Structures are given as structure tokens and as C-alpha cells.
Ligand binder design. Structure first.
Ligand SMILES: Cc1cc2cc(C#N)cn2c(C)c1Nc1ccnc(Nc2ccc(C#N)cc2)n1
Ligand SMILES: [Mg+2]
Ligand SMILES: [Mg+2]
Ligand SMILES: [Mg+2]
Ligand SMILES: [Mg+2]
Lengths: 408, 549
């Protein structure tokens, strides 16, 4: 009922970010949705005196036929004042057997937005071929996808969930942007019934019926493994030595000398080389070293999380999350086929969403991605496959990395 | 008195921390002053301006200029200073419509809204910032002080506020008449439809009444089809670019060539197959417009081909939303690609071209991919959808390429069209070492100070070479080493290198390069039946030999 005053960071004006081209269907979708939101007082028309803009589009979330408005607030969010409630994030969330993700964004629409800040939420619904003026709007209430919405709504949310939390003490609840992550160790059916209990608990107190079920305890990671062979070729040993050399930037005690002693002399690549005893011992010792965790690996909340993705072919993708080079906080692999078999970019987009979800569960924030794709390709297609209500930061890598080989 | 609805004003502010303009009024001739007094008397009488007291600190210079009309004076207020201090506005004029996206109209009428412009009030609190002074005769009295009540010509916020006010006024009329289109440009409204001319003139009269409700009067027009608009000619059923005339010259300066390339780029959106590369390649590293640059034979041929393409008028048709969109691309060579977008065969909605990005190495498939993305994006802007593509590349070629490429890449729904030259993969490296094929261990090195170096190889059959090189670098010698291995081997070969640079280039799979060395290597690769390239770490005591200093 009362708006909490919001300001941008000192020395910063509001976002001015070009609206990117939208398809006919997304435009129709946004016109319907925004017409209804305007009738509901959630948004108001604005005039030419508002210079600011934030891009908008629409998505179809997991297994639903309804469009959802999605504002890309990344610019506003980095320009928006840091809101300090004076959250550590739960460490137990990732340890729970099942976590269900709920879209709670609708709730935000019940809290009015500070007047003087509203101008900064300006967005445009474009017209095809720019034949009619873009319909301009701003938010009267807490918009979905804005940094300030969960921070502001937090006091309301905690109060809403007091009975559920107090009566379900072992259930771990985390909020990130528009999403509510509810973990528990219960049985999947009982779990679904408790989630339903929570969403009805929400409906009573004010499209949240959906759910996304993750099983964090089943998250596999990826230790470094070396081949076990009866007969090694010159090529096999060369690849092994390459891999071990690469591992030695990570793990201190890696030795290639004895193994290298087999690569002295100029031999056919396919010629089989029996391993010496010193070489087999060196290999065994390396294998031992690789079973231990990496030395000096810590998470620092003040630093960016960085995620790298490699295309391994045949629908397989490898990834690594780290803060500092050769200190990996998490590694993983996706063999997943979800509707993507003929489409690389759909695959990559889904990989990015999954990695971001995992990153939110573990550390409570999103990584900056290094994507193995051309800027123009990604920028052209990623919004077609995007199912998530947040969006991360990304950059592009144009030079093929060698490390692909070593992650499988 | 028929009551008219007021036009709601737009709240306007100066840029934060900035105050209004304070600028000295220029001395003017007695003639100019009398003229300005008369003009401003008329304007004041019409309500456009108002006399203000001594209190207002602000000022903007006023000028009198002999009118475009032979006998008259014209008032020019110079708002540059106020414009500098005026807030940014939303500019709806950005991203102009493309004619190929328009729908054909049976009738298009023009309505002069020039009078409606001055019916638009200026924000009350902002008016003081628009103050100006007519200097008095012989400077012996206080100058006459005025401020604007309406959007001033030349002021920063006038076009956006005019447009938004007009749009707001027209919205209910447009929404309740979906069978017409309305578009505002300058002082004119354009109303198209497919209705019978009677019903059309009817809807026009209805619009004039609707406007009258705000007290906006229209002259009851000079402009008729074809329209000359933003560099085009619009006709009821067709569009084209305004005439493109390539000048005859015995010599060309840098400026001439720039203008030429501009005309060609503008023409390329309708005239198919326009080429700019050989003409643009002259413009690099000049900066002097007057400098005369001799034309290469290739530039002359390009310009001639252009002249041929431009010899007679070509037209695009308009968009029919009920029919699918088709885009077809051809390779022109030298990194140039050209395309056509149509619905019915041989009737183009538009045409266009794509030049390869500036880079060290490239291949045809990447370029085709980029062209596809560009056409996709332009097409979503113009028609709101992706066209079906017809491409000079075999399905199998594309399959092989994207399945083996280290980057994620995608092309939307497309089909092969067999119209040479076809895009192909020129070489394909092996995924596993080759049994029976000789194994070449290559290396190169160079002394950084002397720039002397060596490149070479040793193989499993005892084959060896070391070549001494002058004026070279490590990277060059690594490449040269690989080149030698390719040169001296059979149709199938294994090559072992420690060079991450060379592997970084070759794994990118270029079919062409700036470096002649990489080019020679590519030619060699093309000639091979099977090539396996293996990387090993340097200085680990592997069969790759230094040897090379
Ligand atoms: C009505 C419209 C008129 C108009 C005059 C100018 C100028 N100068 C620029 N215009 C734009 C941009 C419009 N806006 C739209 C919107 C949809 N379809 C068309 N089609 C269409 C077809 C034929 C002609 C002709 N002759 C002119 C437009 N125009
Ligand atoms: Mg798209
Ligand atoms: Mg006196
Ligand atoms: Mg012509
Ligand atoms: Mg070496």
C-alpha cells in the first residue's frame, strides 16, 4: 500500500536500450497481455517525455500454451541501487532430495511502485515494419524480472510463508527473482502434494500452478579421468601426455617424464608402444593425484561466477563453472536430447538455462557465460528457445579451445 | 461555439542541473526589426506567442531572413542553445518503414495537418525558457519580449511532441477503422485503404470531422501518387528507389567513390546483383575527399556490371501477409553475396547483399551463415517472420559441417537450390590417425632479434627436411613447417605439431585467408585424400624435433 523509495546508482541515468525485432506472434501476444495489464492498472501509457527504454519479448514456459511477457531488465538491474535488507543464501538447498521451482512473479503485481522510479521501467511494444508508433508503457507496480521486486516484496513474502515454514521446518525455501525454489527430502508424490499445499497457501493469501522439479542430490559433476588400455598407440600416449600436461596446471604433482620417454624417437602414430614400468607407475601416481579435489578452491560472493561450455558433438555438451582459472567450483556434462536433435542453438540455449538454474541453487546467483558461438547467430536465435524468467550475461568465444578434447 | 477538446500538454524539463538559455540578441537592421515586429504581431494575435514582462531572465536569439518567397520576411528563432539544454525525448521516427513491408492500397489520400501543429500547446512551466527579444529601433526602448505558447519550429521537442499528440488523437479513429491505414510524415497525414473511392472519401471526411473535435482544420492536396518518400517512390501497387544515376567521369576522387558506393548500396535493395567490393577496396586508408584515386581494372569491371544492372527501372512489389516469404541467396565471389526476397516467383519484394566481415581467415559456409542471419533479422523487422531459404549448398554438406564444427551453428528452414557456384567443404580432417600413412613430426622456430628461423620435419620412414628462413617469426615457421609436411607427403598423411597457434587456425577450417602461407596450406589440404592433425605439448621430449633452433 506504501511504496518504498527506490533510486538508481549515483552518477547513472536510466536505461536506454533498443527494442530488438519481434515476430508477429510475440507482438500479438504482448499486445493482448499488455492490454489486460493496462486495464488492471499494472502498467500505464507514457508520453515522449520518457526517453528511457528496456527491451521486451514473450516466451512459452515449460509445457504450457500461454505466452508470458518477459522484460530484459539486465541493464536496469545493474543500474539499480543495491538493496541491502541488512541474504547469505541457503547451503542446504542443493543438498535436498527434490527442489520444485515455482513462478511467483504475479505476486509482485500487488505492490505499488515508487512514482519517481516508474519512468525507468519504460518499455516498447514494436510494430511490424515500424508502420505504427510503438506502444509505450511503464510499470505502476513491481515488475517481473526487476532486481528490486524480490528485495522489496521480501517482507511480504516472509510473512505470507510463516505458517508453512513454521509447520514444515525441514523444507528449504529460497527466492531468486521471479522464482521460488522449494526443497524437501520427502517422497515425490508427497512432495508434489506439499508443493500444491504451498501454492494454494499462496493463492489464498493472494501462472503459479506450474512446477519445475530438480533433484540436486543426483547432480553428477565430472572428475578428470584417464584411459585404461591394454595396448597404447603413439597417438594414445600423445593424447594422454597432452591431457596430463593440461591437468598439471590444476593439480600440482602431475608428471609426464616417463610417459614422455616413450614418445622419444619418431614413430608411426598407430604403432603400439608397450608401457614401461616407470611409465605405468607414473600413470598410476597421476591417476591417484586426480582422485583428490583441487587445492585452494573457494567461493567468493564478491566475485563473478564464470561458465564455459564446449560442444562435444552428438548432442553432448560439457561445462565448467569457476571464479579463478583452473579452480573449478563445478563441472558437468549434458547428453540430453530435449526436442533439440537437429538444432545446435536450441541445445546450447537449454544448456545455458540448466547451468544457470544449477548455479542459482548452489550459489544463489548467475554466471557470466562464455559461449562457443558467433554473436550474430546467438543474438538472432536465443529468444526463440528461452523458457526462463531470468536472463544471464554472456560473451562469445571465436577461437576454438584445445580444452574441449580434455573434457571428453 | 462548438466546444473543442483540449490537447493535453507534455511535461517538459531541462536536462538535470541545467538552467535555461541566456543568449545575447544580435543587432538587427531597422528593416529586419520592423519586419519582425509585424510577424510577431500576427503570431501574437494568433495565440502562438505572448508578450512577457521584464522578470524573465532567459533569452534566445531571433533572426529575420529574406523569405523563400520573393517578397516577404521570415522569422527564424535560433534554438541551438535551448536544444542543448533540453531533455532527450522518445523519438518514434527511428527505424523507418521499409516499402517492401507495406501492403498494397487501392487508394492513398494526403491531408495537410500543418494548421494542427500550432494547435498543440507548449508545457506551461517550460514556456519561459523559449523567451526571445525583438531589438528596439535604435536601441532606445526596451526590446519587445515574447515567449511561445505552442511548439516552436526548430525546438528539440517539437517533432516528438507533435507526433505523439497526433498519434494520441488518431488512436481511437484507427482502432475503430481497421480497414484503413494512417501514417504521419512532417505536416502530412497519409490515409490508405482498399475501399471503393466513394467509401474512401467517406472515411476521409469522417477523419476530418474527428480531427475537428479537437478544432483541427484541414485545407479541404498537392501531393498524389507516386510519392517521393525517404529516397523511394511509392506507387499504389509497387515501389522502387528514386532514380539512380551513376555519373560519367574521366577521373574519380575519394568523395566521388564514396558517393558512388552510397548510390550502389541504396540501389542494392531493389536492383539485384549489385557489387561494391572492388570499388570499396579503393577507399581504405585515405581520409582525403579531394584525393584522386585511379580505378583498378576490377573496379572498372564492377562499375560496368553495375551500370548494366541499373540501365532500366526495376520495381519491388508489396507484401501479402497471406503468402509465404521466400529468400534466395547466391555467392558472387570475393566475399560478396546477393539475395532476393519474394512470394510469387520472379516478383521480388526486395533484394540485397552481404559482404564478409573483415578478418584474418574465413570460409564460404560461415559467410553463407552470416548472410542467412542478417536476412533473418531484416526479415523479422520488415515482415515479422523468417523467410524460407533457398541456398546454394547441399544438405549433406551442411550436415557434415554443422555436425563437425566446434561452434554451435544453425540455419532456419531451408532447401538446396542448384545454381552454381555451390558452397562446399574443400577439405575435411581425420578424427583418428591413419594406418599406413607416413607420420610427419613438424617444428619451426625463429630468433626474435635476428628474425632468422628454421622450419621442418622428421618422419617415421626417416624422411627429413629443414629449411632456413629470413624475416620470420615463431608462428610463421610453425605454419611453414606444416606446409612442408603437406608438400612432401603422399595423399594420406599424419602430421604432429606442438603449435597451438597453427592448430587454432586450422581447426577453424578456413577455405581462404589473408596470409598467403595459410592459403598455400589450404591448397595442399584440398589436394590431400586424408589428413590427420595431432597436437602435442612442446618441450616434453616428444619425437617433434629441435633440431630447429
Ligand atoms: C498509408 C501509408 C501512406 C504513406 C505515404 C507515404 C509517403 N510519402 C508513406 N506512407 C506510409 C508509410 C504509409 N503506411 C502504410 C501502412 C501499411 N501499408 C502501406 N502501403 C502503401 C501502399 C501504397 C502507397 C502508395 N502510393 C503507400 C503505402 N502503407
Ligand atoms: Mg527469431
Ligand atoms: Mg532614451
Ligand atoms: Mg535507375
Ligand atoms: Mg618444440
Amino acid at each position: 500500500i506504501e511504496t518504498v523509495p527506490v533510486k538508481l546508482k549515483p552518477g547513472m541515468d536510466g536505461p536506454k536500450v533498443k527494442q530488438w525485432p519481434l515476430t508477429e506472434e510475440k507482438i500479438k501476444a504482448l499486445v493482448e497481455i499488455c492490454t489486460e495489464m493496462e486495464k488492471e492498472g499494472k502498467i500505464s501509457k507514457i508520453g515522449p517525455e520518457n526517453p528511457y527504454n528496456t527491451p521486451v519479448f514473450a516466451i512459452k514456459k515449460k509445457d504450457s500454451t500461454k505466452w508470458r511477457k518477459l522484460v530484459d531488465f539486465r541493464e536496469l538491474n545493474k543500474r539499480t541501487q543495491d538493496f541491502w535488507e541488512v541474504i547469505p543464501h541457503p547451503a542446504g538447498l542443493k543438498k535436498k532430495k527434490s527442489v520444485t521451482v515455482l513462478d511467483v512473479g504475479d505476486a509482485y503485481f500487488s505492490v505499488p511502485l515508487d512514482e519517481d522510479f516508474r519512468k525507468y521501467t519504460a518499455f516498447t511494444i514494436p510494430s511490424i515494419n515500424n508502420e505504427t508508433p510503438g506502444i509505450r508503457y511503464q510499470y505502476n507496480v513491481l515488475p517481473q524480472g526487476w532486481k528490486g521486486s524480490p528485495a522489496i516484496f521480501q517482507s511480504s513474502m516472509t510473512k505470507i510463508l510463516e505458517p508453512f515454514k513454521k509447520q514444515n521446518p525441514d523444507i528449504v525455501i529460497y527466492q531468486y527473482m521471479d522464482d521460488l525454489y522449494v526443497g524437501s527430502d520427502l517422497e515425490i508424490g508427497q512432495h508434489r502434494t506439499k508443493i500444491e499445499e504451498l501454492r494454494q497457501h499462496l493463492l489464498r493469501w493472494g501462472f503459479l500452478w506450474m512446477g519445475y522439479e530438480l533433484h540436486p542430490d543426483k547432480w553428477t559433476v565430472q572428475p578428470i579421468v584417464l584411459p585404461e588400455k591394454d595396448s597404447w598407440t603413439v597417438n594414445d600416449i600423445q593424447k594422454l601426455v597432452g591431457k596430463l600436461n593440461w591437468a598439471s596446471q590444476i593439480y600440482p604433482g602431475i608428471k609426464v617424464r616417463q610417459l614422455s620417454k616413450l614418445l622419444r624417437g619418431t614413430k608411426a602414430l598407430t604403432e603400439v608402444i608397450p608401457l614401461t614400468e616407470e611409465a605405468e607407475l607414473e600413470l598410476a601416481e597421476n591417476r591417484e593425484i586426480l582422485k583428490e579435489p583441487v587445492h585452494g578452491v573457494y567461493y567468493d560472493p564478491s566475485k563473478d561466477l564464470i561458465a564455459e561450455i564446449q560442444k562435444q558433438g552428438q548432442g553432448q555438451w560439457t561445462y565448467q563453472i569457476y571464479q579463478e582459472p583452473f579452480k573449478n567450483l563445478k563441472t558437468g556434462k549434458y547428453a540430453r536430447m530435449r526436442g533439440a536433435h537437429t538444432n545446435d542453438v536450441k541445445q546450447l540455449t537449454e544448456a545455458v538455462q540448466k547451468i544457470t538454474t544449477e548455479s542459482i541453487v548452489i550459489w544463489g546467483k548467475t554466471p557470466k557465460f562464455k559461449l562457443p558461438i558467433q554473436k550474430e547467430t546467438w543474438e538472432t536465435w536465443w529468444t526463440e528457445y528461452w523458457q526462463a524468467t531470468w536472463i544471464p550475461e554472456w560473451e562469445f568465444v571465436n577461437t576454438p579451445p584445445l580444452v574441449k578434447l580434455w573434457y571428453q | 461555439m462548438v466546444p473543442i477538446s483540449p490537447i493535453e500538454t507534455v511535461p517538459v524539463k531541462l536536462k538535470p542541473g541545467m538552467d535555461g538559455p541566456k543568449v545575447k540578441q544580435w543587432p538587427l537592421t531597422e528593416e529586419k526589426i520592423k519586419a519582425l515586429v509585424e510577424i510577431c504581431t500576427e503570431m501574437e494575435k494568433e495565440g502562438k506567442i505572448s508578450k512577457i514582462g521584464p522578470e524573465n531572465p532567459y533569452n534566445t536569439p531571433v533572426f529575420a531572413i529574406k523569405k523563400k518567397d520573393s517578397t516577404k520576411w521570415r522569422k527564424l528563432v535560433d534554438f541551438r542553445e535551448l536544444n542543448k539544454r533540453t531533455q532527450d525525448f522518445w523519438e518514434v521516427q527511428l527505424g523507418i518503414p521499409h516499402p517492401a513491408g507495406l501492403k498494397k492500397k487501392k487508394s492513398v489520400t494526403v491531408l495537410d495537418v500543418g494548421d494542427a501543429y500550432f494547435s498543440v500547446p507548449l508545457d506551461e512551466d517550460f514556456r519561459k525558457y523559449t523567451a526571445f527579444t525583438i531589438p528596439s529601433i535604435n536601441n532606445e526602448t526596451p526590446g519587445i519580449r515574447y515567449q511561445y505558447n505552442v511548439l516552436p519550429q526548430g525546438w528539440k521537442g517539437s517533432p516528438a511532441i507533435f507526433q505523439s499528440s497526433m498519434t494520441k488523437i488518431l488512436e481511437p479513429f484507427a482502432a475503430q477503422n481497421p480497414d484503413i491505414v494512417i501514417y504521419q510524415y512532417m505536416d502530412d497525414l497519409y490515409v490508405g485503404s482498399d475501399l471503393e473511392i466513394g467509401q474512401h472519401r467517406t472515411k476521409i471526411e469522417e477523419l476530418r470531422q474527428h480531427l475537428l473535435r479537437w478544432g483541427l482544420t484541414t485545407p479541404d492536396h498537392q501531393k498524389e501518387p507516386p510519392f517521393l518518400w525517404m529516397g523511394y517512390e511509392l506507387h499504389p501497387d509497387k515501389w522502387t528507389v528514386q532514380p539512380i544515376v551513376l555519373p560519367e567521369k574521366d577521373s574519380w576522387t575519394v568523395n566521388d567513390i564514396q558517393k558512388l558506393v552510397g548510390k550502389l548500396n541504396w540501389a542494392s535493395q531493389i536492383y539485384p546483383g549489385i557489387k561494391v567490393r572492388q570499388l570499396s577496396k579503393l577507399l581504405r586508408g585515405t581520409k582525403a575527399l579531394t584525393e584522386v584515386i585511379p580505378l583498378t581494372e576490377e573496379a572498372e569491371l564492377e562499375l560496368a556490371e553495375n551500370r548494366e544492372i541499373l540501365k532500366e527501372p526495376v520495381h519491388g512489389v508489396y507484401y501479402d501477409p497471406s503468402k509465404d516469404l521466400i529468400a534466395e541467396i547466391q555467392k558472387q565471389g570475393q566475399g560478396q553475396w546477393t539475395y532476393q526476397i519474394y512470394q510469387e516467383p520472379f516478383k521480388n519484394l526486395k533484394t540485397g547483399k552481404y559482404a564478409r566481415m573483415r578478418g584474418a581467415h574465413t570460409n564460404d559456409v560461415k559467410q553463407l551463415t552470416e548472410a542467412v542471419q542478417k536476412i533473418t533479422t531484416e526479415s523479422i523487422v520488415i515482415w515479422g517472420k523468417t523467410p524460407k531459404f533457398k541456398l546454394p549448398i547441399q544438405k549433406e554438406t551442411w550436415e557434415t559441417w554443422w555436425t563437425e564444427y566446434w561452434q554451435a551453428t544453425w540455419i532456419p528452414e531451408w532447401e538446396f537450390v542448384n545454381t552454381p557456384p555451390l558452397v562446399k567443404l574443400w577439405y575435411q580432417l581425420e578424427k583418428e590417425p591413419i594406418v599406413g600413412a607416413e607420420t610427419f613430426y613438424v617444428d619451426g622456430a625463429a630468433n626474435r632479434e635476428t628474425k632468422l628461423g628454421k622450419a621442418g620435419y622428421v618422419t617415421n620412414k626417416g624422411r627429413q627436411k629443414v629449411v632456413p628462413l629470413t624475416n620470420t617469426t615463431n608462428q610463421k615457421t610453425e605454419l611453414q613447417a606444416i606446409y612442408l609436411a603437406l608438400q612432401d607427403s603422399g595423399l594420406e598423411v599424419n602430421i604432429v605439431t606442438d603449435s597451438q597457434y597453427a592448430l587454432g587456425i586450422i581447426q577453424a577450417q578456413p577455405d581462404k585467408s589473408e596470409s598467403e602461407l595459410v592459403n598455400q596450406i589450404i591448397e595442399q589440404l584440398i589436394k590431400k585424400e586424408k589428413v590427420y592433425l595431432a597436437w602435442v605439448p612442446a618441450h616434453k621430449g616428444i619425437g617433434g624435433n629441435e633440431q630447429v633452433d
